[PDB]
Amino acid sequence: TMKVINDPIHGHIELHPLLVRIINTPQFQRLRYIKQLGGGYYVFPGASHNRFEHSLGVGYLAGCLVHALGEKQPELQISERDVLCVQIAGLCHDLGHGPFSHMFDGRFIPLARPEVKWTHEQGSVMMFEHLINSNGIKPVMEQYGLIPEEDICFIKEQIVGPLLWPYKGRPENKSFLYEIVSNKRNGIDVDKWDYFARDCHHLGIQNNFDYKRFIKFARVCEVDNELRICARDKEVGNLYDMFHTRNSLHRRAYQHKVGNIIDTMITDAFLKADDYIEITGAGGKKYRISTAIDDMEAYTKLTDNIFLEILYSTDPKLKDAREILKQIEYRNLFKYVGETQPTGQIKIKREDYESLPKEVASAKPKVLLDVKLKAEDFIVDVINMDYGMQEKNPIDHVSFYCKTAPNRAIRITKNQVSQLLPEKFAEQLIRVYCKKVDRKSLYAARQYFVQWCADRNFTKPQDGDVIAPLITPQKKEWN
Amino acid sequence: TMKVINDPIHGHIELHPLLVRIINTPQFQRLRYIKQLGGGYYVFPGASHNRFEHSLGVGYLAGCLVHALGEKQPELQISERDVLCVQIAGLCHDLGHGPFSHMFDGRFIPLARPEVKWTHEQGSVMMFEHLINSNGIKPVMEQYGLIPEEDICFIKEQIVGPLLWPYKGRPENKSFLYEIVSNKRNGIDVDKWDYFARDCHHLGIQNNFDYKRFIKFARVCEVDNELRICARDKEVGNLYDMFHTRNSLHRRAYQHKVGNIIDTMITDAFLKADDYIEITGAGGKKYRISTAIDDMEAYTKLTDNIFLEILYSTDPKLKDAREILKQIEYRNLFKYVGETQPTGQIKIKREDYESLPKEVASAKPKVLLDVKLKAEDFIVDVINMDYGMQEKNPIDHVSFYCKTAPNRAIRITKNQVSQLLPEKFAEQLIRVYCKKVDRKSLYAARQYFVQWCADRNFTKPQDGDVIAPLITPQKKEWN
Amino acid sequence: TMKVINDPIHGHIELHPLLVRIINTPQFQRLRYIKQLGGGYYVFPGASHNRFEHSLGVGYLAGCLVHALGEKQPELQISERDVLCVQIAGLCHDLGHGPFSHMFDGRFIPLARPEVKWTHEQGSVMMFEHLINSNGIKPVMEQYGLIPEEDICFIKEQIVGPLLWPYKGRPENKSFLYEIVSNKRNGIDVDKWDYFARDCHHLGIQNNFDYKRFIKFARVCEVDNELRICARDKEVGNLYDMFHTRNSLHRRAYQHKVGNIIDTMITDAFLKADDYIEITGAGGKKYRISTAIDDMEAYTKLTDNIFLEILYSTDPKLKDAREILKQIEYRNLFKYVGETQPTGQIKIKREDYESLPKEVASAKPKVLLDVKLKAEDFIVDVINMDYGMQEKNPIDHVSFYCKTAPNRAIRITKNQVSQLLPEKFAEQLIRVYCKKVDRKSLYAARQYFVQWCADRNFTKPQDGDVIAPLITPQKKEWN
Amino acid sequence: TMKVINDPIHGHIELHPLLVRIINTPQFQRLRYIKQLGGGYYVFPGASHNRFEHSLGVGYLAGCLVHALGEKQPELQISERDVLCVQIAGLCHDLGHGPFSHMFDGRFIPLARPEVKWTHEQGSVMMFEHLINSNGIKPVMEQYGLIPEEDICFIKEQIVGPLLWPYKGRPENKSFLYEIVSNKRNGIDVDKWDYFARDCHHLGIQNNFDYKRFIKFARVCEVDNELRICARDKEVGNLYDMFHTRNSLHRRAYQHKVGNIIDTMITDAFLKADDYIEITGAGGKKYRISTAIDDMEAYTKLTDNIFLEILYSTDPKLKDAREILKQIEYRNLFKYVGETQPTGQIKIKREDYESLPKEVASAKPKVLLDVKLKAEDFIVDVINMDYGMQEKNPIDHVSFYCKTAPNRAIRITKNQVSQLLPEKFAEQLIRVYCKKVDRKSLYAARQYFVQWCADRNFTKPQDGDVIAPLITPQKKEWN
Ligand SMILES: Nc1ncnc2c1ncn2[C@H]1C[C@H](O)[C@@H](COP(=O)(O)NP(=O)(O)OP(=O)(O)O)O1
Ligand SMILES: Nc1ncnc2c1ncn2[C@H]1C[C@H](O)[C@@H](COP(=O)(O)NP(=O)(O)OP(=O)(O)O)O1
Ligand SMILES: Nc1ncnc2c1ncn2[C@H]1C[C@H](O)[C@@H](COP(=O)(O)NP(=O)(O)OP(=O)(O)O)O1
Ligand SMILES: Nc1ncnc2c1ncn2[C@H]1C[C@H](O)[C@@H](COP(=O)(O)NP(=O)(O)OP(=O)(O)O)O1
Ligand SMILES: [Fe+3]
Ligand SMILES: [Fe+3]
Ligand SMILES: [Fe+3]
Ligand SMILES: [Fe+3]
Ligand SMILES: [Mn+2]
Ligand SMILES: [Mn+2]
Ligand SMILES: [Mn+2]
Ligand SMILES: [Mn+2]
Ligand SMILES: [Mn+2]
Ligand SMILES: [Mn+2]
Ligand SMILES: [Mn+2]
Ligand SMILES: [Mn+2]
């Protein structure tokens, strides 16, 4: 029978006993010890919430969406097997996040190990494998009608994508099932629905998307010889607003300039510790923070705990890492200098990121200042903000239906909706920080930065006239 | 001493005894009998809230904002007198709404009496006058340090605007006070703050704007020889999102196509009753629903009650009005045919509105029709959606300040914020309805409508290929 | 197919087309015009909510509870027919409330017509009959598998109770179905669940009962040869807290001394109008406010609108009624003198209520005062507060089950739960008010009242020493 | 100037720069790593909140309450100095909590070091001292008008109580200030207000106490030659409900039987690790988990992290500790056998707690047993549930005031409020668990347990007839 758990977002939810078995494992329970927002807790003190609760939510929403489709449309032949696979993928979709979540795959692994291209989602597929293999889960699957050769593959495909029609877990008459946990067509998935609601509750910013409404109006229809989830035509405004909410959440919380600096400092600490910490994996082999991702027995033990392991240590070889964490505790963070954006449809390419602190340091502002600054002293953090498909409008990849022909899919273009929608769907934000924290250096960094913005024809920083009054005169265009 | 009232949105609020005296009058209490959202209750069953509670909220917020400015900046010389006048203006700002709120000044008065320019806000100024004059309020003002020659004028000016520097109630060193209740500079006022939160709570759509945050970061600064309310620079995103919220509330709730059709039907009922209902005003004179606005003693008794007076009557001369309200009760509404918008910087002028049903009826669809339809059978509802200043971006009329120069006001342009903001700030939506409700007539109305949209080079209705498959191929612009 | 409606409490809910048909009738829609809390809106300005939305909620919760039982226990043979009947009874359970809800059957009908014993629930059964008969609903029932001889009876029985085993609508193997809408065994029904949540949302007092949790743990078991709803043993604390919440809601809101006085004043107004208002019922026959309950065509048109009909009238015969409503608008209410309770396990019997204002007026307080007072000047409002079964503990009438024997019903006594629970389950509150509102009379009424409390050996009013300092010395027991 | 922080419970709060300096210390920041509800997160997945955020809330509420008193009563002479000290005490009141909060002072320290009387509050006083002394805070206090000889003492006294009139930090004309952070008179303090709201928000149980209402109605009056905080007379019901809420929160959440068993298992782990984990304190001295409380430099590094340190270790001497934490991860918890209470004014004394597992193991059930169980196999957890003052009614220690004599304090007794209030204000709950988890041993533990309850004349467990049908007939008192 069912086990019931109380979640403040979703209320009392039922967990099928196979889900309980997956949950009550070291590999699942690890997620109690990884904060959803990483460094964002150090800005938003409500945001103590871990990946654990998020994962329970995704699993429950994934089952709500799949059940609702099955009730309304028996003709789809959604089996109890399908329902369970969707639920497990939801539950397990984030098992590969590392310490401070997106800090780990967004900043640490890319700087510490350029020789791999890794993502938490790959992590999740590997960790799922290890969880199943090391806890006897395969006979428990079989016991509920699942067929592991086929279903393990199905689950992994839902989490990460593929490993004509590119999937080995289900056929085209069940493609809709791939659109629930992680929707590669348009991004509209239950994962966003849970984190929207959960992050807002903890952050103290209020959610304006209604996922329940969306589920009541969803429906599977034929689109290009494949059965897909479509929304009612009238929900198009709400789907625009869903993506607008996502961007607003990034702007107010997830990319808060100080949350990002803290994530950068923790990443720096971890870089300075990577040579000297040892995590014991399979066969007693020793891994590093950056290689624990290659062995799931070691990765199991790599959580936000590592922050405190570094902070509390006495080993002299961790002094450098330790002193950075101490600077976070005392709130001697690197200083935010400002934000700018490129113009003229120009994009800053990933190759160039490492060059930008030099360019800032080589600016020649007319005003003379008490201290000169080297490239070492500047951080330039480039952030790619979008509607989750680079430059594309994701509502172009949604199918809709009308009350009068419920089985007939249609498209709806931007022009059919509103002229007050965004004109573009991707941009870049450049933040600049200084590691020298005294007033004299900060005043200098402000001059270098504003000169650099003038030199590159970037947008006038918002406080430009105030922080660099001698410099915003240079550009006639900034009257 | 203070009287405390419990409001579900704002919690326990303190009401100065002068405010109590204004509240406990028939002219104030009338607002318990006018629904905030008018016809919206007939679509959103939680929207039973009236103007009364909204008015208490505006009053309270207006005092919170004025106190917060006073606490932080004693140099502004905000007196207890000023605070109270701001509170009274907030409290009394909506005393001129009529039955079903915006239905009355947006639809009924314009059709019934085209020869007047009238708004609820002018109503409020006149009703405030009648309230003061008929309840002995002027001596109670004097009792608390107010000066009615000056302060009555101040209050009225805050509600309606003016009646060099155009105000007779306060000087330029107190201009900021005009920006609280009704902000003619940029629309950022406590009226929106209350209704956002109150409407959301009742509608069952969740608010994402945080008014308290904005008040913590507000500040008065000198801008162009006038003292004005300015926001912190970092709030600029939140202000863009405030206007986006307002627009989303209009699209989801306030302009819901069925909410609007109900308001239209009620307006029609009222038009057919206007000759035959008699409301007793000053000196026993008899007024009509359309002229009760010229006598505040009569207007006092004109509330949503009139709907029920019509619906419950037996007078044979109200049969026509009555039968329309019966059609609302049985849910035999006029039928929604669809929505379209103009293109290419075409704008539909107010003069033209009355012509549009004819143009729809004169569409000549190629496909034969079994029965014709006349202009009488069509409703065409034009809605001007904007960011509250016609085609202007209201954030261009906001002043900001920076952490490093808190007394120095600055401007922030669109391009300094984001490329994902709206490209325009006004549009028009055209909705078309049919009063003949059977399948045969609805099919026909769909053909006329879609043909008309093709004829005017308007946008393709979302369901066009479904409702008029013979017509959407004609038009090259839609493929 | 289903129609979806958005309710701020229950979110998006589905309405079966038979429910839509019942809803879209004059008899149902009338409930938009009757406030749930009656006079409580005049104290709690959020409490603008009508019976309409409450009724939709009860109907939806009734279906949630019946579906959940059917999913979990197929062996019960809960049919789609049963589900619909339960839903209709929920929907229609409050169709008999009159103006200001419980004011009408609690105060007005008892004073205006002692020759009937009437309740809103009888009203609901009669109004249900009229709605069905006058809107062609019987063939629409048949069309969905319902059998009206049997099912109409079932519905009515759920609302009002019966008209061995006392029911003609369903047998003992379906008794559980009578426990959903109005639970005569123990009061634990979906009606309380909706109003708890809905009243709290509008009042601005927060709900602490979780109905969803309760539904997840409910289960039908055999009890005394009848199938009944039982709760899990662990929910016993939550059922005590449910009734505690109900009592707290009565104390803070529903029996707020000023809400009750307003209800009393409106009742008085209606008493003074009952001879002079005419409501047209079936066959053109004229009914009164007090007799409209005998004809459902007339009752259909009797709503809170009557308040405004009286307030706005000019007929000289309604002057007396009108002037009372005017005193509410200006907030010249009768004055609250205080509260007391009986002691010594004594109960005040209903016979005696009319005698109590005399007894107060005949008190002989030692202090001499400027004005003497007659019985006419006092209101004594006796309120019977309980756990909804007079003196009984309703948790004694609940059956529970244990995780180890889910099909075996058990009892749980107070002593098995806690010693911090109430010792008794019913009491009486006596409120005394004065209709003379000047300071001199109020001071007098305070002396009479406190003397009366001393004379009857009632509890010392809370402010006794302050309002009647000369009198609380009389009783040594009040040191 | 002020720093603003966004808290999901209290919204945007202002922190004086002195508060910022206290906050940004390792001794304050440590609280980010101690869960408010300890083992409760392992039952309620929303309860990931730490002491840090609670501390910010207490600090903020403490200032709201002190400011509100100051605004309304200037005559009290509340200085900015006083306000800040109250804020600091609120902020710092919980700095002495250890790992898993109340698990540490409620269970671990009492078992590990029986020879000390220690509480988190004494911890807080010592940790506050270490924070001040090791971060140069005394000069920053002087900089803002505080006087450390006096004010440090004041702060400590607010947290812990005293160290005629027993306080050295403020005189009798400021006694009210001791009633804000930790109220030794009656327990009505801002600490409860914050945790009620914060725990509810995270637990997913809804709060029904309104702290803001209480603050609007609070007032200082003279009572017995001491100035104290008094409430309006009409709040007496709400104060009874406040304590009832606290008890309901304990019954539903804080004392959930599985929450308590997890805390017990963690405590057991810690007991088995105490000899082998070494924490570096002042002058390089090594401390244990149990002695880190004697050195604030060591205690600084003792947080929930220790759980993970044990679970991730390889030291063979932590195997025993480690295997217990493994049993938590796999959800092989000790098994709950049942709950009982004493009767007849029997009380279980703290001396006796350790004896109770033996008494259970020595029960001689008549029914044969296939296997015996030893004392070692049983846990008996005694919980003292009360209204925060052992057997006293805390409303007997509240002072009230009336509208007509706002400076005159009065008392209100139970019988003047209601007959539905608790008869007692303290009880004990006895929970019994078994460490042998198989069916055979659980069956046996159920017999021992129910026999023991029969032997001690304790209450019949709720499931008694089900778990021990051979035993509950024996006892005449249970039929
Ligand atoms: N009174 C209450 N109100 C709300 N949530 C509650 C609650 N009591 C517990 N929770 C939350 C905490 C959990 O997240 C969830 C389940 O707790 P249990 O219903 O106590 N289930 P368990 O497995 O202990 O008992 P058994 O095995 O006898 O069925 O409900
Ligand atoms: N326990 C409660 N909890 C929440 N709101 C409450 C409440 N009791 C009343 N309200 C709401 C109802 C109102 O919206 C507001 C004031 O009600 P009173 O404090 O009852 N004030 P009144 O003027 O009757 O008493 P006096 O004049 O003797 O002081 O709070
Ligand atoms: N964007 C929105 N967000 C939330 N609630 C909304 C909403 N739009 C409407 N509601 C609420 C208002 C109602 O209480 C409910 C249904 O409104 P519709 O989904 O607009 N249904 P209708 O019958 O107009 O269109 P059709 O016949 O084409 O299906 O949802
Ligand atoms: N748009 C937003 N909405 C809600 N909360 C927000 C928010 N942005 C931030 N927060 C939260 C995060 C924090 O809990 C709090 C303060 O964040 P800042 O206003 O960003 N203050 P900071 O110190 O970075 O800027 P400076 O020092 O230049 O003034 O509000
Ligand atoms: Fe996720
Ligand atoms: Fe307004
Ligand atoms: Fe009801
Ligand atoms: Fe605390
Ligand atoms: Mn993910
Ligand atoms: Mn994604
Ligand atoms: Mn207005
Ligand atoms: Mn406006
Ligand atoms: Mn009822
Ligand atoms: Mn009932
Ligand atoms: Mn504490
Ligand atoms: Mn305490």
Closest CA to D180 of D82, D71, D61: D61
Chain B residues within 8 A of A236 when measuring between CB atoms = 462
Cβ C93 vs Cβ C124: under 8 Å: yes
State the Cα–Cα distance between residues A271 and A110, nearest whole angstrom: 11
- Compute the distance from residue B5 Cα to the ligand 2 centre, in Å: 7
What the block records as the tokens of C436 is 């003379």
By DSSP bridging, strand A226-232 and strand A218-223 are antiparallel
Check if the beta carbon of residue D241 is closer than 8 Å to that of residue D209.
Answer: yes
Distance of CA A185 to the CA centre of its chain: 17
Identify the closest residue of chain C to B313 by CA–CA distance: C280
CA A452 to chain centre: 30
Q: How many CB atoms lie within 10 A of CB B268?
A: 21
From C41, C44, C48, C463, the mutation candidate for ligand 2 (largest count of ligand atoms within 8 A of CB) is C44
Nearest-CA distance B420 → chain A (Å):
5
Residues C228, C226: Cα–Cα separation, whole Å: 6
Those residues of chain B whose CB sits closer than 8 Å to some CB in chain C are: 5-9, 11, 20, 24-26, 29, 32-33, 41, 44-46, 48-50, 52-53, 56, 201-205, 280, 301, 303, 305, 308-309, 312, 314, 326, 329-331
- For residue C41, the 8-state DSSP code is G
Tell me the CA–centroid distance for residue A119 and ligand 5, in Å: 13
Residues D431/D381, Cβ–Cβ less than 8 Å: yes
Q: Which of C416, C423, C462 sits opposite D233 (nearest CB)?
A: C462
SS3 sequence of C262-300: HHHHHHHHHHHHCCCCCEECHHHCEECCCCHHHCHHHHC
What number does the ligand 2 atom closest to the CA of C336 have? 28
Q: For ligand 3, atom 20, which residue shows the shortest CA distance?
A: B256
Q: Whose alpha carbon is nearest atom 9 of ligand 1?
A: D252
What residues contact B448, with CB distance under 8 A and at least 6 apart?
Answer: B360, B361, B363, B365, B373, B378
Residue whose token pair is 């304790």: D458
Q: How many CA atoms lie within 13 A of C245 on its CB side?
A: 27
CB contact under 8 A, C329 and B24: yes
With contact defined as 3+ CB pairs under 8 Å, the chains touching B are: A, C, D
Q: Which atom of ligand 2 is nearest to the CA of D235?
A: 1
Q: Which two tokens stand for residue A256?
A: 């808060």
Instruction: Answer for the pair B365, B471: CB distance below 8 angstroms, yes or no.
Output: yes
Report the residue from C402, C416, C465 with minimal CB separation from D466.
Answer: C402
Kindly list the partner chains of chain C, i.e. chains with 3 or more CB atom pairs below 8 Å.
A, B, D
Ligand 4: which atom is nearest the Cα of residue A203? 5
Q: Given an 8 Å threshold on Cβ–Cβ distance, is B212 in contact with D4? A: no
Q: In the structure encoding, which two tokens stand for residue B440, read together?
A: 């045969």
Cα distance between residue A304 and residue A414, in whole Å: 43
From the list D16, D49, D102, D120, the catalytic residue is: D120
Interface with chain B: mutation pick from A404, A418, A453, A475, highest number of B CBs within 10 Å: A418
C61 CB neighbour count, 10 Å cutoff: 27
Helices D236-249, D190-203: crossing angle, 10 deg rounding: 50
| Pairing between β-strand C378-386 and β-strand C426-434 as defined by DSSP bridges | antiparallel
Please state the atom number of ligand 1 nearest to the C-alpha of residue A3: 23
What is the rounded CA–CA span in Å between residue B288 and residue A471?
67
DSSP string, A149-167: HHHHHHHHHHHH-------
Do B101 and B36 touch, CB atoms closer than 8 A?
yes
Helices (H) and strands (E) in chain C, counts: 19, 11
Q: Do A45 and D29 touch (CB under 8 A)?
A: no
- Rg (C-alpha) for chain B, rounded Å, is 24
Which residues in chain C touch residue D427, judged by CB atoms under 8 angstroms apart? 418-420
Q: Which residue has tokens 């197929």?
A: C74
Q: Does any ligand 2 atom lie closer than 6 A to the CB of residue B7?
A: no
Strands B378-386 and B426-434 come out as antiparallel
Q: Give the C-alpha separation, B277 to B98, whole Å.
A: 16
The closest-lying atom of ligand 2 relative to the alpha carbon of residue C257 is 24
Give the distance from residue D6's alpha carbon to the nearest chain A alpha carbon, in angstroms. Answer: 6
CB contacts of B216 in chain D (<8 Å) are 4, 12, 14
Resolution of the PDB structure in angstroms? 2.2
Cα(B87)–Cα(B77) distance, rounded to whole angstroms?
Answer: 17
φ, ψ (nearest 5 deg) of residue D434: -115, 130
Q: Which residues are within 8 A (CB) of C234 and not within 5 positions of it... i.e. 6 or more apart?
A: C217
Nearest to B8 among C53, C204, C308 (CB): C204
**Closest CA relative to residue D447, chosen from D336, D357, D363:** D363
Spatial contact of C304 and B1, defined as CB atoms under 8 Å apart: no
The answer to whether B457 and B450 are in contact (CB under 8 A) is: no
- In terms of Cα–Cα distance, which of D265, D262, D253, D180 is closest to D214? D180
Chain A residues touching residue C4 (CB < 8 angstroms): 216-217
Tokens, residue C111: 């004073």
Shortest CA gap B454–chain D (Å): 51
Cβ-defined contact of B466 to A402 (cutoff 8 Å): yes
CA of C205 to the centre of ligand 2 (A): 11
Q: Best of B29, B31, B200, B266 to disrupt the C interface by mutation (most C CBs within 10 Å)?
A: B29
Q: Catalytic: which of C120, C130, C202, C256? A: C120
Q: Is C369 in the pocket of ligand 2 (CB under 6 A)?
A: no
C-beta of residue D135 within 8 angstroms of C-beta of residue D120: no
3-state secondary structure chain B: CCEEEEECCCEEEEECHHHHHHHCCHHHHHHHHCECCHHHHHCCCCCCCEHHHHHHHHHHHHHHHHHHHHHHCHHHCCCHHHHHHHHHHHHHCCCCCECCEHHHHHHHHHHHCCCCCCCHHHHHHHHHHHHHHHCCHHHHHHHCCCCHHHHHHHHHHHHHCCCCCCCCCCCHHHHHHHHCCCCCCCCCCHHHHHHHHHHHHHHCCCCCCCHHHHHHCEEEEEECCEEEEEEEHHHHHHHHHHHHHHHHHHHHHHCCHHHHHHHHHHHHHHHHHCCCCCEECHHHCEECCCCHHHCHHHHCCCCCHHHHHHHHCCCHHHHHHHHHHHHHHCCCCCEEEEEECCCCCCCCCCHHHHHHHHHHHCCCCCCCCCCCCCHHHEEEEEEEEECCCCCCCHHHHCCEEECCEEEEEECCCHHHCCCCCECCCEEEEEEEEECCCCHHHHHHHHHHHHHHHHHHCCCCCCCHHHHCCCCCCCCHHHC
**Contact partners, residue A444, CB within 8 Å, separation at least 6:** A369, A370, A371, A372, A373
Q: Gaps in chain A (C–N > 2.5 Å) come after which residues?
A: 163
**Cross-chain CB nearest to C466 (options D343, D387, D408):** D408
* C-alpha to C-alpha distance for C55 and C91, rounded to whole angstroms: 5
Residue type, B157: E
Q: What angle do CA D56, D60, D65 make, to 5 degrees?
A: 150
All domains of chain C in start order, with CATH: 3-259 (1.10.3210.10), 335-384+425-478 (3.30.70.2760)
Q: Do D212 and B12 touch (CB under 8 A)?
A: yes
Query: At a CB cut-off of 8 Å and minimum separation 6, what does A390 contact?
Result: A426
Cβ within 8 Å, pair D7-A49? no
Within 8 A by CB and 6+ apart from D154, the residues are D85, D89, D169, D170, D177
Chain D residue numbers with beta carbons less than 8 Å from the beta carbon of C465 are 410
Cβ atoms of C36 and C56 closer than 8 Å: no
Hey, what are C189's tokens? 């029904």
Å from CA of A303 to ligand 5 middle: 16
On whether the CB atoms of residues B267 and B108 are closer than 8 A, the answer is yes
Q: Residue D404: CB within 6 Å of ligand 2?
A: no
d(CA B227, CA B245): 28
Tell which atom from ligand 1 comes closest to the C-alpha of C238.
1
- Report the residue from D251, D403, D421 with minimal CB separation from C422: D421
Beta-carbon separation of D216 and B6 below 8 A: no
Give the integer Cα–Cα distance in Å for B305 and B279.
12
Using CB atoms, which residue from D208, D236, D247 is nearest to C206?
Answer: D208
Query: What contacts C275, CB < 8 A, 6 or more positions away?
Result: C288, C317
